[PDB]
Design a protein around this ligand. Structure first.
Ligand code: K
Ligand code: K
Ligand code: K
Ligand code: K
Ligand code: K
Ligand code: K
Ligand code: K
Ligand code: K
Ligand code: K
Ligand code: K
Ligand code: MG
Ligand code: MG
Length: 1332
RNA sequence: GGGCAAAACUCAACCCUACCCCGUUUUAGAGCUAGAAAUAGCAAGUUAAAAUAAGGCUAGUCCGUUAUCAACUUGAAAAAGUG
DNA sequence: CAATACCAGGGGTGGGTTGTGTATTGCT
DNA sequence: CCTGGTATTG
């Protein structure tokens, strides 16, 4: 017979269905294997495979990087110790041993328990002298005396082990370190530019004001308030704001045209500033330079909170200041508490559980938690004003190793280390000879372009070696072929040209590439004037003239410039009409202008002889971000430029890559013409062919060479092909499961390929939205965050999120919005919900009243646009509002929405265009249709139809085949069945639609695509449609409105649906990552081989990879008498390899004896067992079970629950709304009935006596509640019966905690069921037959 | 119209390298006084070492948490096969 | 033995890719 | 968050 397949692909489920030409679901007798008495079973050909979500490779990669980092840090310490080996041997022959075994307890220590000095007196004396490591570091930096080699090692090792970040390149340039010295020089330069309006900085304490621990805006205010007649938005105020790290706008200071927002931290900044400089010149260059220097000094004084006069170890001195102030403040706080709150001293200083000082030090309290706990204690006390201020500045009782130490650059640690080396090399000759080695150990970092230093056993590595010896930081340049390794980095990184697959893609900012884009756009530009009959192309001379006169003198070329600056000036046209370009030219020559500003040699740029050198320069600037490598590759061109241009160029940086190779653009030439693609793009007579026309023109060579070039390589497997698809790994796991389901379904139907396969794909935090708001107000320069504090979780509500996105302003009315009145306010859809279902914040907007939007059918009225356009663009620059949202807000000025707009919105709602769905369709099509005809065209025996969820959702809502997701998992299978039905019927009714729905090769649309699915309806908003629905041409019947609806209903009401939870071996981390303290418990796992957890603590809570059923004997009692057992042993992920290498030895080491090797059953997670009365359990672990049954609630109750709970929308037909409400009230008794159907189920399968009794009491409690709320809570009640892991749920206000199945003893005598992917093929094993 | 390409603006999803900072764990940093002793009173507290998936062989300044997996007949395996 | 309350490593820096809609020029 | 491990508690 003939049949079709319906599929619903999700992130966790693949629903599948088989239908006949009558839209019926077949049933079949399937053979049952095993050792049970049942040999076959009847099954319906509907079901749904369920699985756990597929995970990305991000967490694995981060674990891998942390692993490599720990390894290499240990290697750094090893290098330092090998350097110190021979002399430390003379000083202390067991020092490094004591350091290595510092973790062991004294019982296991092979040496003295005191690490540094091997005796208690010297150790205690050391600690008294240096309370922290930073004391010793500063001392070794400053003191002139010879020091103990062990203390030198400790200081250098602490500097190398925690060496600081690498965000700053080169040396730190410590001549401009003082904030006052740079602020005074900034005042000098500013007064230089303005002799008439100077600023007197006398008595201005810039050090205290600018280095204070306050917000940047507050420090700006405090500095400006010290300058009378000067304001914060003046030029000097904006310069100070730029130095503090803010985003000033210099547009108003220089009477500019548009925004000149600067910020030193943005990567664009350089360009930005130089852009700005073009407006006013180079007089202000060194002014902004002085501002940047002042900013660097402030960034340093943020870290080096100590003056640099007395010491050369400012970091260690700042740490010592922390320690001393902590000591003073702690002494004072204890004295104060003894004075006024001696009742609370012990809780504060002895209680670790409380967030006092004790928990802050010994417990688990954090600095923030400690501040919150002790702030009211300080406020209630007297004499704590200084301590209170210190708390508010986040600077009280501070430790030295804190979270904010991440801003410390490595050059600071390097300065202190180099100072110690200089001091102590006068006494230790090996320190003098190895100074640069020890410095290298701190500075050297494996380059980003080299990767893992592997030797042929790493799938991540790509490095090649000049010689075959061990790589150290010192011999790196001699062992590693940096040239070939960087070349391989390039090859691994860059995409290939698709037309020429053996050629690399040009950089996105290549001069040749932007020339290509400009000429390709400019070629298809036509123009017309009065004395012209027809618009004409530009000639080659015209195009070269427009390039030389406009594209090489202005970064952007506007149509206005094209008309006035070219056609008026050269062609003498008073008027002209341009076509092919609107507003401005998308393409431009930005790289040309960059290199023009840098090299200052327009002739050098315009010489065809310099094409190769400039291309290589741009390539080098795009490949790398490393200063060393960039400097290295531009040395061949060092003779052509001076040092100033060379430095400017070294700073020039680019990212991104094009999509075409250079051999395609200006390499291959037409055989006849001898011209390249770019040659035609510059001049093609009057034809003016562009890139597409140039590679698709049979008249010229290119197409032939392209076809000669392309190669279809060695084909991927199915799994490989799916993996290489663009998309999330979850949906790709779903796709692979879909293909396997389809394979097995074809196998079930006697290997007969179906006629149709309908596929549907489901379309489907706090920190990122808080980040949006945080950056948005920062850019806006507003203070609403200051006025209204809000936590990240509070943004679960969408109204508050929209509010803080809108800066207190109303989006349709220029009026402030009230925080406390947020209840009344209205969330409106920019493009309305009637036309588009976009419930995202992108089509959402918070306003005082919906009315103020203007009319509803169109986009907000032109008046509202004219009003709020500036505020909308300001929110767009702050990125609080996206460009899509902005364009939708202002569409009225462009005419609102056209008829084509609405028609296309509908068509996109109905036709799927998502690429991943097309890829799945391609895979299924290429697997089903494999033969060719006499014309060698593909034989499409199977048709792959693709649907969007709105079709079947609307079908359910129209004909009341409602879905309730929380009842069971049948809705996936039902979605698949309805997909098959609707797709098949739709393409039967309208074959012309195949173009839109099958894979392979005025206002009319608004009515057509909105009425395509009306042939199911009997009545219409007039004419009654025929009860029988046929194809107009073939006459074949497509839909019987008297029977096929009944068929769909009978199919949806079927209780037997093949729901299969995919059994899976667990993978990932061995256990919880927490390192637990020591404890007397055999659940603790040692973190090292010899670290007994009873002494050293360790891990617990491992993940079971899979359980194993063991039938064996164990020793019982002192006599060790063998007693027979049959139990579940969970093999952990960590034990899995050793178990699989030899299971017998593994089990015997566990204590089992005489193991029946052939009765060992591997049981992954979710293994299915059946017990009595059809009760089913799934394996959640070796010692816990999940619910294994589905509640097949009758369709009547599903529809009643949908309607009574107001599950989605109300029908919108007032008569029909009253119809449905009357049905709900007439069938109210269903409530009780539903409960009964649950109770019975729970009594037969769930077996939670206490939970069921509490649920029944709760249901009887709220019997006078409205029907809608009782139904909405009955919807929750299905958590008790849902398949899978138990969960807690609320019925009204009563909470029902999950009942767990903490024992797997019963499944050992149950029936184990092995199901195929559809669950149609089974193997049933009676486990009670094993053991004895 | 369906598929496709490049440019412009855009946001979502993914893949990879080199590093940084905390956290946790054990040990070290002589607790004192009064008691037989339980215990009570006070003193102190900020730091470091070392581990940071057990570990593996290929012994690399490498690898170790992604993807893939019902059962059965083969095969050592990858694979094929069975209702 | 089974019921049950508690708990689960976090933050930052670089690069590359496909796909998303909007609209320009085009191929097929 | 979800859901399985874990110690408490009878
Ligand atoms: K991390
Ligand atoms: K010992
Ligand atoms: K002032
Ligand atoms: K703490
Ligand atoms: K444009
Ligand atoms: K770069
Ligand atoms: K896995
Ligand atoms: K997993
Ligand atoms: K299975
Ligand atoms: K893109
Ligand atoms: Mg390790
Ligand atoms: Mg630490």
């Amino acid at each position: 017979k003939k049949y079709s397949i319906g599929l619903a692909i999700g992130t966790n489920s693949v629903g599948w269905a088989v239908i006949t030409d009558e839209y019926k679901v077949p049933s079949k007798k399937f053979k049952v294997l095993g050792n049970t008495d049942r040999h076959s079973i009847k099954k319906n050909l509907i079901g749904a495979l369920l699985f756990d979500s597929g995970e990305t490779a991000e967490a694995t990669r981060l674990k891998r990087t942390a692993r490599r980092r720990y390894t290499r840090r240990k290697n750094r310490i090893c290098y330092l110790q090998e350097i110190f080996s021979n002399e430390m041997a003379k000083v202390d022959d067991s020092f490094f041993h004591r350091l290595e075994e510092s973790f062991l307890v004294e019982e296991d220590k092979k040496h003295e328990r005191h690490p540094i000095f091997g005796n208690i007196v010297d150790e205690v004396a050391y600690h008294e002298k240096y309370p922290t490591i930073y004391h010793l570091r500063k001392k070794l930096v400053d003191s002139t005396d010879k020091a103990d080699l062990r203390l030198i090692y400790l200081a250098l090792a602490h500097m190398i082990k925690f060496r600081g970040h690498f965000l700053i390149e080169g040396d730190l340039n410590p001549d401009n370190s003082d904030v006052d010295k740079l602020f005074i020089q900034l005042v000098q330069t500013y007064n230089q530019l303005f002799e008439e309006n100077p600023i007197n900085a006398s008595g201005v304490d810039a050090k205290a004001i600018l280095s204070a621990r306050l917000s940047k805006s507050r420090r700006l205010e405090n500095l400006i308030a010290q300058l009378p007649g000067e304001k914060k938005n003046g030029l000097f105020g904006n310069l100070i704001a730029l130095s503090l790290g803010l985003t000033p706008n210099f547009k108003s200071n220089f009477d500019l045209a548009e925004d000149a927002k600067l910020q030193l931290s943005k990567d664009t900044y350089d360009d930005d500033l130089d852009n700005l400089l073009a407006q006013i010149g180079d007089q202000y260059a060194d002014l902004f330079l002085a501002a940047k220097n002042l900013s660097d000094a402030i960034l340093l004084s943020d870290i080096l909170r100590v003056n640099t006069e007395i010491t050369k170890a400012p970091l260690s001195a700042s740490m010592i200041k922390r320690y001393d102030e902590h000591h003073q403040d702690l002494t004072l706080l204890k004295a104060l508490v003894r004075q006024q709150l001696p009742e609370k001293y012990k809780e504060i200083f002895f209680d670790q559980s409380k967030n006092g000082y004790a928990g802050y030090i010994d417990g688990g309290a954090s600095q923030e938690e400690f501040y919150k706990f002790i702030k009211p204690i300080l406020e209630k006390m007297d004499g704590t004003e200084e301590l209170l201020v210190k708390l508010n500045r986040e600077d009280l009782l501070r430790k030295q190793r804190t979270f904010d130490n991440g801003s410390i650059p490595h050059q600071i640690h390097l300065g202190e280390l180099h100072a110690i080396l200089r001091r102590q090399e006068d006494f230790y000759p090996f320190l003098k000879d190895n100074r640069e080695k020890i410095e290298k150990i701190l500075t050297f970092r494996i380059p980003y372009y080299v990767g893992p230093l592997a030797r042929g056993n790493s799938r991540f590595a790509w490095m090649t070696r000049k010689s075959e010896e061990t790589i150290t930081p010192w011999n790196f340049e001699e062992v590693v072929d940096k040239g070939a390794s960087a070349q391989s980095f390039i090859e691994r990184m860059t995409n290939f040209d698709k037309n020429l697959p053996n050629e690399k893609v040009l950089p996105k900012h290549s001069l040749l590439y932007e020339y290509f884009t400009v000429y390709n756009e400019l070629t298809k530009v036509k123009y017309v004037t009065e004395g012209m009959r027809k618009p004409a192309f530009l000639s080659g001379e015209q195009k070269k003239a427009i390039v030389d006169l406009l594209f090489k003198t202005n970064r952007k070329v506007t149509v206005k410039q094209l008309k006035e600056d070219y056609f008026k000036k050269i062609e003498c046209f008073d008027s002209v009409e341009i076509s092919g370009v609107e507003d401005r030219f998308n393409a431009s020559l930005g790289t040309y202008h960059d290199l023009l500003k840098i090299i200052k040699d327009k002739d050098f740029l315009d010489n065809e002889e310099n094409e190769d050198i400039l291309e290589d320069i741009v390539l080098t600037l795009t490949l790398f971000e490393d200063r060393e490598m960039i400097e290295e590759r531009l040395k061949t061109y060092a003779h052509l430029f001076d040092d100033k241009v060379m430095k400017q160029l070294k700073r020039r940086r680019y990212t991104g890559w094009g999509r075409l190779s250079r051999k395609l653009i200006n390499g291959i030439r037409d055989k006849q013409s001898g011209k390249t693609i770019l040659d035609f793009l510059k001049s093609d007579g009057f034809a003016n062919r562009n890139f597409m026309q140039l590679i698709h023109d049979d008249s010229l060579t290119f197409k032939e060479d392209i076809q000669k070039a392309q190669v279809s390589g060695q084909g991927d497997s199915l799994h490989e092909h799916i993996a290489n698809l663009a998309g999330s790994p979850a949906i790709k796991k779903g796709i692979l499961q879909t293909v396997k389901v389809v394979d097995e379904l074809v196998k079930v139907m006697g290997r007969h390929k179906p006629e149709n396969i309908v596929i549907e794909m489901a379309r489907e935090n706090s920190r990122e939205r808080m980040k949006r708001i945080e950056e948005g107000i920062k850019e806006l320069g507003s203070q609403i965050l200051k006025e209204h504090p809000v936590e990240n979780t509070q943004l679960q509500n969408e109204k508050l999120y929209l509010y803080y996105l809108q800066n207190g302003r109303d989006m349709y009315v220029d009026q402030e919005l009230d925080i406390n009145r947020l209840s009344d306010y209205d969330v409106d859809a920019i493009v309305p919900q009637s036309f588009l279902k976009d419930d995202s914040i992108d089509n959402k907007v918070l306003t005082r009243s919906d009315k103020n939007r203007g009319k509803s059918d169109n986009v907000p009225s032109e008046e509202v646009v004219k009003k709020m356009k500036n505020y909308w663009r300001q929110l767009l620059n702050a990125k609080l509002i996206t460009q899509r949202k902005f364009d939708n807000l202002t569409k009225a000025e462009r005419g609102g929405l056209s008829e084509l707009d609405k028609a296309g919105f509908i068509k996109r709602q109905l036709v799927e265009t998502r690429q991943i769905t097309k890829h799945v369709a391609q895979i299924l099509d290429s697997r089903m249709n494999t033969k060719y005809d006499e014309n060698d065209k593909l034989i499409r025996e199977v048709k792959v139809i693709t649907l969007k969820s709105k079709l079947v959702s609307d079908f359910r809502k129209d004909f009341q085949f409602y879905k309730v997701r929380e009842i069971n998992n049948y809705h996936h299978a039902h979605d698949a069945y309805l997909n098959a039905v609707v797709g098949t019927a739709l393409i039967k009714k309208y074959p012309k639609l195949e173009s839109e729905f099958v894979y392979g090769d005025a206002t009319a649309k608004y009515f057509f695509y909105s009425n395509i699915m009306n042939f199911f309806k009997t009545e219409i908003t007039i004419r009654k449609r025929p009860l029988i629905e046929t194809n107009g041409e073939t006459g074949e019947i497509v839909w019987d409105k008297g029977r096929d609806f009944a068929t769909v209903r009978k199919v949806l009401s079927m209780p037997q649906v093949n729901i299969v939870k995919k059994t899976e071996v667990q993978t990932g981390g061995f256990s919880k990552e927490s390192i637990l303290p020591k404890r007397n418990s055999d659940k603790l796992i040692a973190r090292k081989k010899d670290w007994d957890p009873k002494k050293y603590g360790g891990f617990d809570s491992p993940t079971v990879a899979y359980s194993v059923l063991v039938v064996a004997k164990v020793e019982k009692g002192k006599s060790k008498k063998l007693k027979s057992v049959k139990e579940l042993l969970g093999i952990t992920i960590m034990e899995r390899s050793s178990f699989e290498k030899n299971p017998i030895d593994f089990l015997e080491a566990k204590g089992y004896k005489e193991v029946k090797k052939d009765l060992i059953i591997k049981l992954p997670k979710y293994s299915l067992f059946e017990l009595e009365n059809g009760r089913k359990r799934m394996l959640a672990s070796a010692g816990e079970l999940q619910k294994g049954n589905e509640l097949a609630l009758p369709s009547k109750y599903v529809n009643f629950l949908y309607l009574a709970s107001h599950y989605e929308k109300l029908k919108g037909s007032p008569e029909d709304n009253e119809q449905k409400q009357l049905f709900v009230e007439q069938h109210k008794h269903y409530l009780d009935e539903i409960i009964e159907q649950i109770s019975e189920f729970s009594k037969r399968v769930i077996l939670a006596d206490a939970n069921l009794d509490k649920v029944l009491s709760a249901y009887n409690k709220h019997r006078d509640k409205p029907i809608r709320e009782q139904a909405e809570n009955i919807i929750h009640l299905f958590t008790l019966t849902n398949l899978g892991a138990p969960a807690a749920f609320k019925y009204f206000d009563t909470t029902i905690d999950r009942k767990r199945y903490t024992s797997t003893k019963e499944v050992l005598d149950a029936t184990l069921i092995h199901q195929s992917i559809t669950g149609l093929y089974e193997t049933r094993i009676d486990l009670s037959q094993l053991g004895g």
